[PDB]
């Protein structure tokens, strides 16, 4: 009925992830009805996430809002979109550096496989959150 993140407005005092985005404004970017591209990091990037980048980058712009479900941006992008652009825009409007010498780059993280195409989008796998 609802879309996912509409709900979080919707809510009756759910737990904080709906309001997570809710204060990350967020709550109106994340209502992208089109593609999804989610950059998915590894077993050792989730080790990253322990209270390190994710940390520091909610101290940073709305990208919390990003974060909280599926720490994914809209708009289907294949990695030779983002490199052919050298740079990658968060739903919320947050741009993060692509890099690429022969695996996609993005920020200080490193891409395993990315031109995955997820449910709505696309899945980049990278080594570093």
Same mark, same amino acid.
């Given at each position: 009925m609802a879309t996912i993140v509409d709900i979080a407005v /919707?809510?009756?005092?759910?737990?904080t992830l709906v309001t997570a985005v809710k204060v990350a404004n967020l709550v109106e970017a994340l209502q992208s009805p089109g593609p999804f591209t989610v950059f998915a990091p590894n077993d050792d990037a989730f080790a990253k996430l322990p209270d390190g980048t994710i940390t520091s980058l909610v101290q940073n712009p709305p990208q919390l809002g990003r974060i909280l479900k599926y720490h994914v941006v809209a708009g289907a992008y294949k990695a030779t979109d983002l490199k052919r652009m050298g740079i990658v825009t968060s739903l919320e409007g947050s741009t993060i550096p692509i890099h690429g010498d022969n695996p996609l780059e993005v920020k200080n993280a490193t891409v395993?496989? +990315?031109?995955? @195409? +997820? @449910? /709505?989008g696309i899945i980049h796998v990278i080594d570093t959150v």
């Open positions: /919707n809510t009756p005092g759910f737990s395993l496989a +990315a031109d995955i @195409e +997820a @449910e /709505n």
